[PDB]
């Protein structure tokens, strides 16, 4: 059993008051007051982020931890926060975005965020059974939390396998993908094998809530996997009892318009 396995059990053992005090303490959170209601009322002329994912991918790129360029594929795009971010980047030429949609899952939000015309959204698509195709950059933000750590580990392993398939088709592709439960031994093993073939490493973004152990894998960085996960598990355990709240920051506004 890992330190992160312990963290998950301690999290599940929290009272509701302990859970509410823990989940957001010390984390960056974008101010979504205006974006949330523009999306609810169906406004489509807006460049404010459609989801909290946009700021996370922006942080990774600004840190230099991901390379977004060329033909981008967004696997499990949900509302599309990563697709709209990639579409606004000058080095990106097009985005093919796929997501399952349907009951309980998010469909793409349709807005005129800068470069929207370069995105081809396809909902109703299961990326785990879809044949890979050409891509310069492969992005995947898939991983639904579960109180059951074995389920989180299985969901994570499926994403790593998916990324191996896309790398087999595109050995030179830049990759960035969510690793929902890096604290599971079977995820660490699958990640180590990915690293030995393709390079890369793991990083925690400051927007992730303390109630999730999610980290992001990118071929553009390096680092011992076991050390990265353990450092993060210690940080998550250290925040139990912290009284500070979230740090509020402005939401990303990409502006509106086409790219040609
Ligand atoms: N001690 C608690 N831990 C919680 C709780 N809610 C979530 N969590 C943990 O955070 C993890 C991430 O939570 P997330 O950000 O995805 O929030 P959600 O509400 O969308 O997660 P769900 O699992 O779908 O929650 C649905 C209901 O499940 C309840 N729930 C979920 N886990 C718990 C636990 N462990 N104890 C008590 N109640 C729990 C929770 O109150 C909700 O009413 C989750 O997997 C759990 O390990 C919680 O209420 N109490
Ligand atoms: N097998 C699958 N095939 C396609 N989409 C899937 C999938 N499994 C989960 N998904 C979708 O993947 C999404 C991951 S969350 C998407 C967040 C996105 N990066 C943003 O910034 O908005 C969810 O909407 C889920 O419905």
Domains of the chain: which residue ranges? Answer: 1-260
Do residues 132 and 171 touch, judged by C-beta distance below 8 A? Answer: no
Task: Give the pair of three-digit tokens for residue 251.
Answer: 């939401």
Pairing of strands 174-179, 215-218: antiparallel
Signed CA dihedral, 122, 126, 130, 135: sign only: positive
Nearest Cα to Cα of residue 249 among 37, 88, 33: 33
At how many Å resolution was this determined? 1.9
The Cα–Cα gap between 229 and 212 comes to: 13
The Cα–Cα gap between 125 and 112 comes to: 23
Do residues 97 and 121 touch, judged by C-beta distance below 8 A? Answer: yes
Do residues 118 and 91 touch, judged by C-beta distance below 8 A? Answer: no
Backbone torsions φ then ψ of 154, nearest 5 degrees: -65, -45
The Cα–Cα gap between 137 and 71 comes to: 6
Do residues 138 and 166 touch, judged by C-beta distance below 8 A? Answer: yes
48 is in an annotated binding site: no
The Cα–Cα gap between 60 and 67 comes to: 9
- Residue showing tokens 């598990």: 233
Looking at the chain, which runs of residues are DSSP E strands? 28-31, 70-75, 92-99, 119-123, 137-140, 174-179, 201-203, 215-218, 247-250
Task: Give the pair of three-digit tokens for residue 63.
Answer: 């840190």
Q: How far is the CA of 238 from the centre of ligand 2 (A)?
A: 30
Q: How far is the CA of 215 from the centre of ligand 2 (A)?
A: 16
51 is in an annotated binding site: yes
Q: How far is the CA of 97 from the centre of ligand 2 (A)?
A: 10
Residue nearest to atom 2 of ligand 2 (CA): 126
Residue nearest to atom 16 of ligand 2 (CA): 78
User: Which residues on neighbouring strands pair with residue 140, listed in sequence order?
Assistant: 75, 177
Do residues 109 and 80 touch, judged by C-beta distance below 8 A? Answer: yes
Residue 9 burial by CB count (10 A; 0-12/13-18/19+): exposed, middle or buried? exposed
DSSP annotation of 252: P
Residue nearest to atom 47 of ligand 1 (CA): 147
Q: Which of 51, 61, 78, 160 to mutate to test the pocket of ligand 2 (most atoms within 8 A of CB)?
A: 78
Q: Is the CB of 148 under 6 A from ligand 1?
A: no
Nearest-atom number in ligand 2 for the CA of 106 is: 24
Signed CA dihedral, 177, 178, 183, 187: sign only: negative
User: What distances in angstroms separate CA 198 from CA 74, 80, 131, 163, 174, one per listed residue?
Assistant: 19, 26, 20, 11, 10
The Cα–Cα gap between 21 and 74 comes to: 33
12 is in an annotated binding site: yes
The Cα–Cα gap between 132 and 145 comes to: 25
235 is in an annotated binding site: no
Experiment used for this model: X-ray
The Cα–Cα gap between 135 and 73 comes to: 6
């Amino acid at each position: 059993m890992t330190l992160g396995d312990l963290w998950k059990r301690r999290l599940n053992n929290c009272t509701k008051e302990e859970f509410f005090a823990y989940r957001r303490t010390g984390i960056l959170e974008t101010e979504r007051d205006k974006a949330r209601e523009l999306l609810r009322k169906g406004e489509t002329n807006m460049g404010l982020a459609v989801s909290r994912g946009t700021a996370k991918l922006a942080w990774l790129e600004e840190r230099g931890y991901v390379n977004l360029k060329g033909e981008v594929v967004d696997l499990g795009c949900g509302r599309g926060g990563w697709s709209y971010y990639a579409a606004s980047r000058p080095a990106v030429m097009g985005v093919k975005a796929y997501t399952i949609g349907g009951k309980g899952h998010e469909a793409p939000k349709m807005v005129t965020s800068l470069g929207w015309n370069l995105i081809k959204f396809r909902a109703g698509m299961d990326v785990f059974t879809m044949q890979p195709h050409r891509a310069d950059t492969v992005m995947c933000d898939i991983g639904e939390s579960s109180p059951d750590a074995a389920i989180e580990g299985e969901r994570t392993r499926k994403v790593i396998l998916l990324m191996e398939q896309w790398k087999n088709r595109n050995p030179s592709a830049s990759c960035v993908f969510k690793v929902l439960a890096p604290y599971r031994p079977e995820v660490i093993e699958a990640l180590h094998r990915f690293q030995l073939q393709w390079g890369g490493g793991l990083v925690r973004t400051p927007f992730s809530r303390n109630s999730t152990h999610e980290m992001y894998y990118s071929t553009a960085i390096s680092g011992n996997i076991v050390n990265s996960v353990n450092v993060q598990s210690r940080k998550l355990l250290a925040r139990f009892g912290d009284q500070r709240g979230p740090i509020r920051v402005p939401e990303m506004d990409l502006g509106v318009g086409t790219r040609h």
